[PDB]
Amino acid sequence: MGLYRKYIEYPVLQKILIGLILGAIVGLILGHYGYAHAVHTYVKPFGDLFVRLLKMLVMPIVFASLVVGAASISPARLGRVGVKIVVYYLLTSAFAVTLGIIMARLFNPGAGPPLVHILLDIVPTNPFGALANGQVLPTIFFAIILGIAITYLMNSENEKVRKSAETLLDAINGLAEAMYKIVNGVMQYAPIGVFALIAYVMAEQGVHVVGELAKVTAAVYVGLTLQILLVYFVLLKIYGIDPISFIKHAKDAMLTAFVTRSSSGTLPVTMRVAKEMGISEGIYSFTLPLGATINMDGTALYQGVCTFFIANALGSHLTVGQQLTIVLTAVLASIGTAGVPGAGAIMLAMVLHSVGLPLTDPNVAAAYAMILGIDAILDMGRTMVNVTGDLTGTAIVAKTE
Numbered sequence: 001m002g003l004y005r006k007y008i009e010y011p012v013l014q015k016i017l018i019g020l021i022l023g024a025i026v027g028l029i030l031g032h033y034g035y036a037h038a039v040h041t042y043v044k045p046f047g048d049l050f051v052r053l054l055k056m057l058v059m060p061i062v063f064a065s066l067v068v069g070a071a072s073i074s075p076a077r078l079g080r081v082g083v084k085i086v087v088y089y090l091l092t093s094a095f096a097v098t099l100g101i102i103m104a105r106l107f108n109p110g111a112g113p114p115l116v117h118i119l120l121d122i123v124p125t126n127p128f129g130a131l132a133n134g135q136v137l138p139t140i141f142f143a144i145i146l147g148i149a150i151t152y153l154m155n156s157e158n159e160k161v162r163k164s165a166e167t168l169l170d171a172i173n174g175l176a177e178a179m180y181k182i183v184n185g186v187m188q189y190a191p192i193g194v195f196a197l198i199a200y201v202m203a204e205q206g207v208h209v210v211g212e213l214a215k216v217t218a219a220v221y222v223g224l225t226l227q228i229l230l231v232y233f234v235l236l237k238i239y240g241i242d243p244i245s246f247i248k249h250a251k252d253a254m255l256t257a258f259v260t261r262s263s264s265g266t267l268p269v270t271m272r273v274a275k276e277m278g279i280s281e282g283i284y285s286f287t288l289p290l291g292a293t294i295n296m297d298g299t300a301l302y303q304g305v306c307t308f309f310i311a312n313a314l315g316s317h318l319t320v321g322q323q324l325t326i327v328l329t330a331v332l333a334s335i336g337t338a339g340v341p342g343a344g345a346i347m348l349a350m351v352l353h354s355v356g357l358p359l360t361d362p363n364v365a366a367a368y369a370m371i372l373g374i375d376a377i378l379d380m381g382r383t384m385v386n387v388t389g390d391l392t393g394t395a396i397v398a399k400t401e
């Protein structure tokens, strides 16, 4: 076709980066000349199509890949990896949100759920209904249950049941391997989408990011970088794995999660960098699709610093906010959020409705609107630390096995 084949000749991460750079440059130039409605009605629909594709991909890829993932064995490896991976994700997410409580105290703010039905909603009251209407967490539950039942059926004695279980597992594996090819097809289109998205985001609200609300995003970025270098480095340093080689060996997945702003949009490159890391296929194949959508350390560290930006601009106080329930509801919102770009803001609204200062006041929508505008640049570092937390967990359970 001509220049199209040269466009599918470049490597991907030497192209999404040039899209981000030439999006931020043209966004700043068109923000210095006041073309904000021009970008918002001409260039932003490409980024909205990109976000539409990354939302489309998440629901088959969290079901079929997770059913295939729960086919190592039923008892031993699955049980031990399950317990020592969910408690690992819980401690990493809780340490991230208590770092967020630690943050915005050395840093500054910017001036200018019935508590058991949330856990009972994990069990889906209808599996196809909880697969249609979003609901990533009950889809995860039903997918793990179906995987365990399929790996029980494959060890049966009747030949017809064995053939039927093998055919069902091969069908779901065909869907889970077709969704990765659709991910590759989307991430070929990705530089146009990230160009449009960062162009609009730098144009509309990002023109004054460094003037005011610079200390909140400085708090987010310094907290995420210190989260990396003070949790993941020490967790690789406990179990005897050199972590600078871990960054230089997983920088592929780190960078594509940094630019595409989706944890579940970087699942194939995270799987290929685990195999290029050589973790082992049977030991990552369950915990990477689980960890892609059950632990988000970026949103966990992000909800605390967002609630401290809102509550310390014009809010009640910090100890009247009762930070322990902020930690708990932020861990729950990190667990229950999806892997799309603009996901954690809605769960942040859920956190604020659940802990205090709900979204009805005339001085809470004005603080939330600025962070809804600036959410798109924080999503980058959020998904970056999420995918490298997944990779860190896979390397840890590679060590203790």
Ligand SMILES: N[C@@H](CC(=O)O)C(=O)O
Binding pocket: 261, 262, 263, 264, 296, 298, 299, 337, 338, 339, 340, 341, 342, 343, 344, 345, 379, 382, 383, 386
């Ligand atoms: N972008 C995050 C969610 C968020 O921070 O809004 C994810 O893909 O999981």
